[PDB]
Amino acid sequence: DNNKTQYFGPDGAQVKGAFQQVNKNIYFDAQTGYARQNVGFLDGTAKGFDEQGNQIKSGIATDLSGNVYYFDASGKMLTGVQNIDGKKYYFDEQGHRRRNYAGVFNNEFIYFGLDGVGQSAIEYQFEKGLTSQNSVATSHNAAKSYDTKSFTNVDGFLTANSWYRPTDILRNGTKWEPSTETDFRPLLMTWWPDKEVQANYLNYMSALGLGDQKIYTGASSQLDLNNAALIVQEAIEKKISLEKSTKWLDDSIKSFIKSKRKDIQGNLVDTNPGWTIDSETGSTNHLQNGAFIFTNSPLVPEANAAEGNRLINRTPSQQTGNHISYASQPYSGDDWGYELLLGNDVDNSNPIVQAEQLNWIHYLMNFGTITAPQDPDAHLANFDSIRIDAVDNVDADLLQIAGDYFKAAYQVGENDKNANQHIHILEDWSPNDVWYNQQVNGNSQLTMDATMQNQLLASLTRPITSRDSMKSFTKDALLVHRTADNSYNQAVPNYSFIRAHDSEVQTIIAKIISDKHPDLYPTVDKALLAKDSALYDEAFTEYNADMQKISSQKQYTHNNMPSAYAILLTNKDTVPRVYYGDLFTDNGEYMANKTPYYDAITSLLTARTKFVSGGQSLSVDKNDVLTSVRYGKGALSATDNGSSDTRNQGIGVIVSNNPNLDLNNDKVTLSMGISHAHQAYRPLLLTNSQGIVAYATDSEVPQNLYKTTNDKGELTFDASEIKGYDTVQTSGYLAVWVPVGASDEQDARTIASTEKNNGNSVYHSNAALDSQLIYEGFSNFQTVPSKNASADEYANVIIAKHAADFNKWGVTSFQMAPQYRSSTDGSFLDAVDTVQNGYAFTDRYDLGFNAADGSKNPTKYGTDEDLRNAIKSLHAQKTYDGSSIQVMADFVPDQLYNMPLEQAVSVIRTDKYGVNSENPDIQNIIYAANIKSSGTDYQSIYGGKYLAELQKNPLFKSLFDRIQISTKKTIDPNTRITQWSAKYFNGSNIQGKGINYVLKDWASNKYFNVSSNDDMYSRLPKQLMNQESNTGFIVDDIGVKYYSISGYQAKNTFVEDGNGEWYYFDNDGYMVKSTEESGPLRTVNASSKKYYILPNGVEIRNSFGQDIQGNTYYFDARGEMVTSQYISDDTQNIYYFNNDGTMAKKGG
């Protein structure tokens, strides 16, 4: 080649990766053919060779790993200390040149740095000298007073955004005037926590025209930095006089703190890492990429919780303190819960909180009467039931608290009739929760059947590649066996569904976002943090397009949706839940656009009302065609002769999921009952190439389609009728047949019994309960009515109009969205301003009240008025048993978002389970968390308001006396929660304020605090109170002392100097420096932790060190000696360090 020389064997082979001669030991690289420089150990140990070939004499030579050898003339390597070009270098006994290595060599203490270059460990490495922080101006800039008055503060603490009142204002930069009350200025104008930040602040403000055209750094002198700040101050004050405002300064101070910068490498780094998320590192396993747990500390007395509160992870499975599987042989008993989900996690193991949760439930259940007392119909605008949200992320005690309430208020334990008038539901995703619910929790709330959901998806909704057999519907792991469901009051009461506002929607969108912009959002979990409205609009045009496509070309969305809904709505022993987004489009105006499936599904829904009743049986023939039969009311098997009600009731369903179904000579059979022999049947739903046909009466059917049962009550189908299809709505075949001659009076539903029941379950899976149906009446991605939206865009108005629609569909429980005024801060999907769905809120009692000026100010769904009217219209609708349509409140006890006020709290960095991510610098440190509510919100009005009232009631005695499982204590209604505070929270997601956002003197190592004059906090910087103040290192006949920028002395702390070396200062206020009498290896603080301190005082880090005896130790990033441990080196070298701390010796 050219500029490359390569060699091949006396053979086909290239000879990559080994040494070979020609006429000179040329190494050739294992990947590149190319001849490289290398060091060969063959023959005499340690020979060295260059690219051209031939031995290296008297020169440096570098290894494939990166090891640097030095040879003498004659080719032998050198070891020990060597002077190469008037520079000392250390070579170990392996001949490697080494960096970050300290030791006494030939009676000289040397430290070889990152270079490899020796420094004298005798010579001081810091600037000798102090620098006064007293100026002509310090008298004027000193604080007006040293207490809460004169500082903006978080519980007494100061942050980087603290503003203060100085004694004088340099007014229009020309005249020192006494300061008025409103003359506050940002602390960062006159004080900084070290020189580096000071330097950066100066460059930044100068970049806004308020500064010097000169670049500064931490390397720059202290006195220059101070003088330059004064020039900036003149500029600031003139601008303030010009603008008649300081808001501009607040803006530019805030943006400085989060400013980014170039680096040496050339990338964007944070200018102030300790004031941003960058410094908040730990585990990523939390939806928002980090979490804190709040933990008590003496420094922060009012953020501290009581003893034995903050019990994390009391999921139904672990309510006791330990996992308990309630599941039996076929079923799973896993728990996938975890305490810290999103936002600020409410502590529901605190009994005062638990009472506040009860209060809230009472409020919702009486929302109408409470909010509109003057209105004589207030009593008709009350909620009826609740949906418990995020059950696996809150203390399970709450399930019992609620169960107790509804027994107390509505006597739901008495009979089916009362129970079924208030139908609650759990968001209980863990498998174990089904059985916990049954054994521990009565069935006070309805479990979800997840086995049904997952099977409907696997067997029908998947593409053909991934799709399960229909035979799976007759499997054993299913919660409710329906192969021969011929009884009542056996099945575990449950609600079953296919999609929901979150499940099987938001993840399909996030996948699309990710498959278009992997650059920005590489995973689906990450994509849920997407906040740009552009990204959703884009994704949705795709999603909507995909839904219109044929089944074989559905790249993103669910196949066979009407086939699935047909099984779900005809199934026995379940309360079905319909998702809004399967009738209507998940995006756009509320109820404005229908899906491809609206016809099919709304047919089924009314049909259910007329025919679906009696016993059930599932089958799947050799061809894998599912045939589900309902025998009609009064008949529980195929061999049952039934009641008078049987003849004209009882549906039958046929489903295949094979698009190339060819029956050939085979036959499909719907075995209706012997109660249905010699009987004419007609289709409700059928599949063409064009789509699905829906016949809505007998008279819409053509006579040839009619078909009559034989003497056994069977229907038989040919290949002429049933083949494979591939439409938008069906891969495989779908058919629904109903008996001919039904009347308009005919209703298949059953009235609830008023008899007392045996056992502990509130609900019982029987005919009456199966007469119920839930409609999830919202979507995440419903468009958000713009500021000046017309009154009829708001979903709660549209609900009221269409009230009868839902009654016609058989709806008995209308599950509304959460109605709580949403955050718009984009911290998570639910809080982005384009989908303020109502799961992200600050004020749990605010369901859309008018503003203070009395202007209508609604939620996404409408005003409080509009909500009250939605509930009245639904209540005004009456179902088959004469009772109203129930309205369901989404009960969201897990968290709060986006709280207005900061509080000081003690934090530990953790993951979502609460497990300490063990970052050293985040161990019970002080954080300014947005964790306190306004105290003027509706929480402050209604919080705990009804608890005194409720205690006095006899009916609630059980509730209040009940011993809760996890707390082992009873609920505590005696304290009211009107302001949320940190003490009522388990923890929070990481808020990116930065570790060092709360300000602190580094010499004393105490926090500043202006609300206290206790000795656990440091007094204000000495200059900010017009006292003498100096900073720097000062050498003395005794030793070395150090004063911080604030003027205090270093005692019992480590101290980093000029982004370089670390040092330690003892109890006497003196630097620690090893002497000849007392060597370098030293405990310093009664911690069992050993450091390596040079005679400079330099405490070495990421570096090896030596005894005078000859042993080697390694000291980690924190400077601590390493024990019982392997250490990998830069050049891929390995060293083992014994429990001893000493290195294990090598020699080869």
Q: Which residues bind Ca ion (CB under 5 A)?
A: 339, 345, 393-394, 894
CB of 499 to Ca ion, least distance (A): 25
Q: What are phi and psi of 921, to 5 degrees?
A: -80, -5
423/387 Cα distance (integer angstroms): 9
What is the number of the residue whose Cβ is closest to Ca ion? Answer: 345
CB of 312 to Ca ion, least distance (A): 8
CB of 523 to Ca ion, least distance (A): 24
Residue 1081, classed as helix, strand or coil, is strand
55/455 Cα distance (integer angstroms): 72
Answer whether 185's CB lies under 8 Å from 177's CB. Answer: no
**HSE-up of residue 177 (Cα within 13 Å, Cβ side):** 11
Identity of the amino acid at 658: N
What is the secondary structure of 828-896 as a DSSP string?
SGGGSTT---SSSBS-TT-SS---TT------SS--HHHHHHHHHHHHHSB-TTSPBPEEEEEE--SEE
Answer whether 654's CB lies under 8 Å from 723's CB. Answer: no
576/776 Cα distance (integer angstroms): 10
Identity of the amino acid at 1147: G
CB of 986 to Ca ion, least distance (A): 6
* Residue 484: both structure tokens together: 């021969």
> What is the spatial order of strands in the sheet that 97-98 belongs to?
80-83, 88-91, 97-98
Nearer to Ca ion, 183 or 345 (CB): 345
CB of 234 to Ca ion, least distance (A): 52
443/615 Cα distance (integer angstroms): 23
Answer whether 911's CB lies under 8 Å from 283's CB. Answer: yes
Nearer to Ca ion, 384 or 428 (CB): 428
Nearer to Ca ion, 394 or 774 (CB): 394
Which CA distances in Å does 455 have to 704, 759, 1104? 35, 30, 60
171/159 Cα distance (integer angstroms): 25
CB of 582 to Ca ion, least distance (A): 30
Nearer to Ca ion, 345 or 356 (CB): 345
CB of 393 to Ca ion, least distance (A): 5
Strand extents, DSSP E, 259-399: 260-261, 269-270, 291-294, 344-346, 385-388
CB of 980 to Ca ion, least distance (A): 14
Long-range residue pairs from 202-211, CB within 8 A, at least 24 positions apart, any chain: 202/228, 202/229, 202/232, 204/256, 204/259, 204/271, 205/232, 205/235, 205/236, 205/252, 205/256, 206/232, 208/252, 209/235, 210/235, 210/236, 210/239, 211/235
91/96 Cα distance (integer angstroms): 5
Alpha helix (H) ranges present in 706-777? 767-770
Nearer to Ca ion, 428 or 894 (CB): 894
Nearer to Ca ion, 324 or 353 (CB): 353
Nearer to Ca ion, 291 or 600 (CB): 291
Nearer to Ca ion, 272 or 393 (CB): 393
Residue of 50, 39, 51 whose CA lies nearest to 5: 51
CB of 894 to Ca ion, least distance (A): 5
Helix axes of 598-611 and 561-570: crossing angle, nearest 10 degrees: 10
Nearer to Ca ion, 293 or 722 (CB): 293
Nearer to Ca ion, 339 or 864 (CB): 339
Which residues are CB-neighbours of 226 under 8 A, at least 6 positions away?
Answer: 133, 135
Answer whether 1065's CB lies under 8 Å from 1071's CB. Answer: yes
Nearer to Ca ion, 345 or 428 (CB): 345
Nearer to Ca ion, 315 or 772 (CB): 315
Residue 570 is classified by DSSP as: H
CB of 940 to Ca ion, least distance (A): 23
Nearer to Ca ion, 66 or 321 (CB): 321
CB of 987 to Ca ion, least distance (A): 9
Nearer to Ca ion, 752 or 965 (CB): 965
- By CB neighbour count within 10 A (0-12 exposed, 13-18 middle, 19+ buried), where does 824 fall? middle
Place of tokens 């003892």: 1066
CB of 337 to Ca ion, least distance (A): 9
Residue 143, classed as helix, strand or coil, is strand
Nearer to Ca ion, 781 or 984 (CB): 984
252/210 Cα distance (integer angstroms): 11
CB of 544 to Ca ion, least distance (A): 35
Nearer to Ca ion, 848 or 893 (CB): 893
Phi/psi region, residue 32 (left: phi>0; alpha: psi -120 to 50; beta: rest), is beta
CB of 840 to Ca ion, least distance (A): 15
CB of 1145 to Ca ion, least distance (A): 54
1126/1116 Cα distance (integer angstroms): 12
CB of 338 to Ca ion, least distance (A): 9
Residue of 1108, 1142, 1027, 1061 whose CA lies nearest to 138: 1027
Nearer to Ca ion, 393 or 486 (CB): 393
CB of 396 to Ca ion, least distance (A): 11
